[PDB]
Design a protein around this ligand. Structure first.
Ligand SMILES: *[C@@H]1O[C@H](CO)[C@@H](O[C@]2(O)O[C@H](CO)[C@@H](O[C@@]3(O)O[C@H](CO)[C@@H](O)[C@H](O)[C@@H]3O)[C@H](O)[C@H]2NC(C)=O)[C@H](O)[C@H]1NC(C)=O
Ligand SMILES: *[C@@H]1O[C@H](CO)[C@@H](O[C@]2(O)O[C@H](CO)[C@@H](O)[C@H](O)[C@H]2NC(C)=O)[C@H](O)[C@H]1NC(C)=O
Ligand SMILES: CCCCCCCCCO[C@@H]1O[C@H](CO)[C@@H](O)[C@H](O)[C@H]1O
Ligand SMILES: CCCCCCCCCO[C@@H]1O[C@H](CO)[C@@H](O)[C@H](O)[C@H]1O
Ligand SMILES: CCCCCCCCCO[C@@H]1O[C@H](CO)[C@@H](O)[C@H](O)[C@H]1O
Ligand SMILES: CCCCCCCCCO[C@@H]1O[C@H](CO)[C@@H](O)[C@H](O)[C@H]1O
Ligand SMILES: CCCCCCCCCO[C@@H]1O[C@H](CO)[C@@H](O)[C@H](O)[C@H]1O
Ligand SMILES: *C/C=C(C)/C=C\C=C(C)\C=C\C1=C(C)CCCC1(C)C
Ligand SMILES: CCCCCCCCCCCCCCCC(=O)O
Ligand SMILES: *C(=O)CCCCCCCCCCCCCCC
Ligand SMILES: *C(=O)CCCCCCCCCCCCCCC
Ligand SMILES: [Hg+2]
Ligand SMILES: [Hg+2]
Ligand SMILES: [Hg+2]
Ligand SMILES: [Zn+2]
Ligand SMILES: [Zn+2]
Ligand SMILES: [Zn+2]
Ligand SMILES: [Zn+2]
Length: 340
């Protein structure tokens, strides 16, 4: 056999040398060198040191500036939060693991690690479907009359949390499960073994279809309609606003892919070629690289949303003077409404 199946794991290392051992009981240093682990540990340490402030600041600024209530500002508050969950929920355990060499906290540390990453990535995917719509109703405007009040914005955010849970919560209760991957420092869904005892085979399709293919077809086709109205470049007059938020909601989709396609791809490969011959390094790269999903969203936001960027500077400068190159929002300053 080219892997070592366990009742809890599956190390992608042969054990015709009795060197293999439970990623929940001893260092996996025979899978690679002790420094590559120190790399993962340094790398995660930086991810935590970065995703934390970026996401926390984002959260903070959104709430402090009382006029940042568009559905988009809503969605990003959501991501900023989900992201903070990953940071503490999972990255905490994935850092301690990479350090001490194995899932020293057993399956729990593994479900923390694995659960909070899925929760975080699916929330991002399902959020992208919300934006894919909120974006459809503003450009290819349907009803001769409509705009999303915070009313409907709190709807789509509550939604991404149901869908995300529908996908990440099951493995914690008996449908599929979180098992360590790569150098065994991160935990993912079970693609490795059939384990009829929990039905991993069923879930993995449930997930690849209900939580990957479909949201992707939705998000892709919806875009095919928004291929005339708001063309694709960038640089009333209130049209260059929604014509710009859109170019953002689109760079968010490129990024999601860049992040999960390589993982999802390797994950689907495994499922299809279970028990074949792959190494620990195989999935360690797309798995760990995807952990940057806990921080790129706010970066895109702060760079593609002139409005938020200044609101961020405004909070950071306590007062103002945001060296810009259009409307507003804040607190005791000009957070006054200007509707109709
Ligand atoms: C690869 O093959 C190895 C041997 O061929 C397996 O190693 C062991 O089976 O590991 C167990 C640990 O569970 C050892 O038995 C001990 O440790 O069991 C209890 C732990 O619950 C201890 O308290 C006792 O002291 C036992 O020694 C075995 O000694 C050891 N086998 C050997 C080297 O003879 C190894 O698990 C296997 N890899 C896999 C499939 O994970
Ligand atoms: C062990 O791993 C090897 C490497 O994949 C498996 O060999 C291989 O996959 O076998 C399939 C059919 O069984 C061939 O079509 C293919 O050519 C092989 N891959 C190569 C290029 O070596 C082998 O099947 C695995 N054994 C198991 C299931 O434990
Ligand atoms: C997408 C760029 C175009 C901006 C319009 C979309 C978001 C609408 C924000 O509306 C404002 O929300 C405030 C509460 O947050 C209300 O107090 C205020 O009366 C209302 O007018
Ligand atoms: C982190 C996410 C990475 C996404 C990077 C996306 C940047 C690619 C932008 O494309 C370019 O936009 C110009 C303006 O419209 C076009 O004139 C040009 O032909 C097109 O190639
Ligand atoms: C990590 C994600 C950040 C990468 C940014 C993705 C490339 C999109 C570039 O588009 C341009 O950005 C300018 C901001 O200076 C806008 O003023 C301009 O109208 C817009 O067309
Ligand atoms: C869009 C990015 C998605 C990435 C998906 C990558 C999955 C392809 C894996 O290929 C296989 O890897 C094995 C060991 O690594 C080789 O032994 C085998 O010959 C090779 O065919
Ligand atoms: C994205 C790259 C795809 C490659 C997938 C297989 C990589 C497996 C690497 O294995 C490791 O190589 C070290 C140096 O040879 C050995 O010391 C160690 O024991 C072995 O476990
Ligand atoms: C380091 C830990 C990781 C990456 C753990 C778990 C991730 C998943 C189970 C991923 C789910 C997927 C996402 C977020 C995006 C589309 C579908 C999917 C299965 C690839
Ligand atoms: C000029 C561009 C910089 C972009 C670079 C791409 C090269 C790839 C990164 C792969 C990340 C792998 C994850 C870290 C594992 C620790
Ligand atoms: C509200 O407006 C908050 C004030 C923001 C001021 C930020 C000052 C930055 C700190 C300067 C550090 C310079 C390097 C010092 C090295 C010893
Ligand atoms: C306004 O006074 C000029 C801006 C310079 C001060 C801003 C300091 C740099 C921002 C660093 C971000 C850290 C925020 C931490 C959030 C938890
Ligand atoms: Hg769209
Ligand atoms: Hg990314
Ligand atoms: Hg602002
Ligand atoms: Zn079992
Ligand atoms: Zn989901
Ligand atoms: Zn199978
Ligand atoms: Zn500016």
């Amino acid at each position: 056999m080219n892997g070592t199946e366990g009742p809890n794991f599956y190390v992608p290392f042969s054990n015709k040398t009795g060197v293999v051992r439970s990623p929940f009981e001893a260092p996996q240093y025979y899978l690679a060198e002790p420094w590559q682990f120190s790399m993962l540990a340094a790398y995660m340490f930086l991810l935590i040191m970065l995703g934390f402030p970026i996401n926390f600041l984002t959260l903070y600024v959104t709430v402090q500036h009382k006029k940042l209530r568009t559905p988009l500002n809503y969605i990003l508050l959501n991501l900023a939060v989900a992201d903070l969950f990953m940071v503490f929920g999972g990255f905490t355990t994935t850092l301690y693991t990479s350090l001490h060499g194995y899932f020293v906290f057993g399956p729990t540390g593994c479900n923390l690690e694995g659960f909070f990453a899925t929760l975080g990535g699916e929330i991002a995917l399902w959020s992208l479907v919300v934006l894919a719509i909120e974006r459809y109703v503003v450009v290819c405007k349907p009803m001769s009359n409509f705009r999303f009040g915070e009313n409907h914005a709190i709807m789509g955010v509550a939604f991404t949390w149901v869908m995300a849970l529908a996908c990440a919560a099951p493995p914690l209760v008996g449908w599929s499960r979180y098992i360590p991957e790569g150098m065994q420092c991160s935990c993912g869904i079970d693609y490795y073994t059939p384990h009829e005892e929990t039905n991993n085979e069923s879930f993995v399709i449930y997930m690849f279809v209900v939580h990957f293919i479909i949201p992707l077809i939705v998000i892709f086709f919806c875009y095919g309609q928004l291929v005339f109205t708001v063309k694709e470049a960038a640089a009333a007059t209130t049209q260059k606003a929604e014509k710009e938020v859109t170019r953002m909601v689109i760079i968010m989709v490129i990024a999601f892919l860049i992040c999960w396609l390589p993982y999802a791809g390797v994950a689907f490969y495994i499922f299809t070629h279970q028990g074949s011959d792959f190494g620990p390094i195989f999935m360690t790269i797309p798995a760990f690289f995807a952990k940057t999903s806990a921080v790129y969203n706010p970066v895109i936001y702060i760079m593609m949303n002139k409005q938020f960027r200044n609101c961020m500077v405004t909070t950071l400068c306590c007062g103002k003077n945001p060296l810009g190159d259009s409307t507003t929002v804040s607190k005791t300053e000009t957070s006054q409404v200007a509707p109709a």
